[PDB]
A = this chain, B = another copy of it.
Amino acid sequence: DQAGITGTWYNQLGSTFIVTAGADGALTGTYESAVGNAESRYVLTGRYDSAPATDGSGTALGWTVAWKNNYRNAHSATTWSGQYVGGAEARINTQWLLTRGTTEANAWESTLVGHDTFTKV
Interfacial residues, chain A to chain B (CB-CB below 8 A): 13, 24-27, 35-36, 43-53, 55-68, 73, 75-83, 85, 93-105, 107-115
Residues of chain B with a CB closer than 8 A to A58's CB: 101-103, 107, 110
Pair A76/B101 contact, Cβ less than 8 Å: no
Pair A111/B109 contact, Cβ less than 8 Å: no
What is the copy number of this chain in the assembly?
4
A60 to B74, CA, bound (A): 9
A95 to B99, CA, bound (A): 9
Pair A111/B108 contact, Cβ less than 8 Å: no
Whether A60 touches B95, Cβ cut-off 8 Å, given contacts A66-B25, A112-B112, is no
A20 to B46, CA, bound (A): 15
